[PDB]
Scaffold this motif. Structure first.
Motif, mmCIF file in Angstrom:
data_model
loop_
_atom_site.group_PDB
_atom_site.id
_atom_site.type_symbol
_atom_site.label_atom_id
_atom_site.label_comp_id
_atom_site.label_asym_id
_atom_site.label_seq_id
_atom_site.Cartn_x
_atom_site.Cartn_y
_atom_site.Cartn_z
ATOM 1 N N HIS A 88 0.826 -1.193 0.000
ATOM 2 C CA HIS A 88 0.000 0.000 0.000
ATOM 3 C C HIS A 88 0.865 1.250 0.000
ATOM 4 O O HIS A 88 1.886 1.316 0.685
ATOM 5 N N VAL A 89 0.441 2.252 -0.759
ATOM 6 C CA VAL A 89 1.065 3.570 -0.737
ATOM 7 C C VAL A 89 -0.013 4.594 -0.428
ATOM 8 O O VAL A 89 -1.090 4.576 -1.030
ATOM 9 N N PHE A 90 0.272 5.477 0.514
ATOM 10 C CA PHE A 90 -0.627 6.574 0.833
ATOM 11 C C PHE A 90 -0.247 7.733 -0.082
ATOM 12 O O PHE A 90 0.853 8.288 0.066
ATOM 13 N N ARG A 99 7.129 5.939 7.554
ATOM 14 C CA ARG A 99 6.159 5.164 6.786
ATOM 15 C C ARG A 99 5.968 3.793 7.422
ATOM 16 O O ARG A 99 6.893 3.227 8.021
ATOM 17 N N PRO A 104 3.936 0.883 5.727
ATOM 18 C CA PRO A 104 3.876 -0.322 4.874
ATOM 19 C C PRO A 104 5.206 -1.044 4.738
ATOM 20 O O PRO A 104 5.221 -2.282 4.755
#
Ligand SMILES: *[C@@](O)(c1nc2ccccc2s1)[C@H](CCCNC(=N)N)NC(=O)[C@H](CC(C)C)NC(=O)Cc1cccc(CNC(C)=O)c1
Ligand SMILES: [Cl-]
Ligand SMILES: [Cl-]
Ligand SMILES: [Cl-]
Ligand SMILES: [Cl-]
Ligand SMILES: [Cl-]
Length: 241
Positions: free
Chosen positions: A123-125, A227, A229
């Motif tokens: 996942h990337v925000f 971060r 993830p």
């Protein structure tokens, strides 16, 4: 938190307050399972004659709303058994600023105490995504902490912009979240607490860990967060979660 508002009781039941050495609240953390918290490695470093690295010196308060109401119904106190800092963490650059805190006895889940979900490694925000930050840190840089838990909505900032605003300081483990105009930001005492992201289906995932910033809430100086993830597998390997 600068520029935020009082959280509702029970609104952030994964938010934890970490006290040490009779000094009151020092850092935040997040509940991820009955026995484990996520926090920032930098909070657990001996300094100034105080043995902050000793897990036995800490008390975690779960289900807490107001630092002056630590005996309110639903508040739980727990000792720490151990603090696992990421093996690549270092306190020169603050890269890999994440730690896992093992509770001496498990949390009892309730409406006021329950865990936040961890995001998958893929996942990337994305830049622009709205995210919540919470904590009992200062409400102004150079100021004083909040008795009542604060919340503020911030947004992911473009990573290249982040790097350029804070030259020679942003590694790929870090993410700027806030506003380029400032105004809403985390601050001293929010360190180690979670970013909480509401995803499209309403599920909330932890999107990062409060780490550092140049002042607080200043234009062109958004907060810097670790971060999450990237660390999913490390968390699983060390906690089973
Ligand atoms: C955390 O709440 C806390 N960190 C500690 C560490 C020891 C005891 C108590 C506490 S509370 C706080 C969160 C700040 C978030 N700020 C914004 N979102 N704007 N973190 C800090 O205070 C950190 C602590 C270090 C050990 C990582 N320090 C800073 O935030 C100050 C800072 C660090 C790194 C670079 C710069 C940029 N300065 C220059 C000249 O470039 C500032
Ligand atoms: Cl567990
Ligand atoms: Cl305990
Ligand atoms: Cl991310
Ligand atoms: Cl941006
Ligand atoms: Cl400007």
């Amino acid at each position: 938190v600068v520029g935020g508002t009082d959280a509702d009781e029970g609104e952030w039941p994964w938010q934890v307050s970490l006290h040490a050495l009779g000094q009151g609240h020092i850092c935040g953390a997040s509940l991820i399972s009955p026995n484990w918290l996520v926090s920032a490695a930098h909070c657990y470093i001996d300094d100034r004659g105080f043995r902050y690295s000793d897990p036995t010196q800490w008390t975690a308060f779960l289900g807490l709303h107001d630092q002056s109401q630590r005996s309110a119904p639903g508040v739980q106190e727990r000792r720490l058994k151990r603090i696992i800092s990421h093996p690549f963490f270092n306190d020169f650059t603050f890269d890999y600023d994440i730690a896992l805190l093992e509770l001496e006895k498990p949390a009892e889940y309730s409406s006021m105490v329950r865990p936040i979900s961890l995001p998958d490694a893929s996942h990337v925000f994305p830049a622009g995504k709205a995210i919540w930050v919470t904590g009992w840190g200062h409400t102004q840089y150079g100021g004083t902490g909040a008795l009542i838990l604060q919340k503020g909505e911030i947004r992911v900032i473009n990573q290249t912009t982040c790097e350029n605003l804070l030259p020679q300081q942003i590694t790929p483990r870090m993410m700027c979240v806030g506003f380029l105009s400032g105004g809403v930001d985390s601050c001293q005492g929010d360190s180690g607490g979670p970013l909480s992201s509401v995803e499209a289906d309403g599920r909330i995932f932890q999107a990062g860990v409060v780490s550092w910033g140049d002042g607080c809430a200043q234009r062109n100086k958004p907060g810097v967060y670790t971060r999450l993830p990237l660390f999913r597998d490390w968390i699983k390997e060390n906690t089973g979660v």
